[PDB]
């Protein structure tokens, strides 16, 4: 940072929750804990421009876990095609998707 008074005193006031995977109160871990724990470990020991290009395989997965743009689009295309099929008159949704089942 700018004025490392905190690191000098070897203390912490805000920087212990600066990100997602910090110590949550009753051990309730957040959504993308693992992806964060890998992104940080790849972006540690090195600084900046190294990480902005040698951590993408570990950061795109994270951003997806966090937002899931690609999964949204996948499911969207699936449902669009299914609707078109049930329109043209070729599909016939089975029960487990159509309203009942033999659950646990």
């Amino acid at each position: 940072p700018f004025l490392d008074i905190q690191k000098k005193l070897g203390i912490s006031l805000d920087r212990h929750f600066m990100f997602l995977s910090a110590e949550q109160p009753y051990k309730n871990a957040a959504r993308c804990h693992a992806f964060e724990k890998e992104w940080i470990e790849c972006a540690h020991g090195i600084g900046g421009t190294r990480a902005k290009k040698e951590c993408k395989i570990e950061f795109d997965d994270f951003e997806e876990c966090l937002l899931r743009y690609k999964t949204m689009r996948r499911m969207h295309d699936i449902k669009k095609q299914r609707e078109k099929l049930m329109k043209e008159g070729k599909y016939t949704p089975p029960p487990h998707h159509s309203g009942r089942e033999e659950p646990r």
């Binding site: 004025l3 490392d4 008074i5 000098k8």
Partner: peptide
């Protein structure tokens, strides 16, 4: 200010 082990505010 990020060089290896830049002892801060010393």
């Amino acid at each position: 200010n990020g060089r290896p082990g830049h002892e801060p505010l010393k």
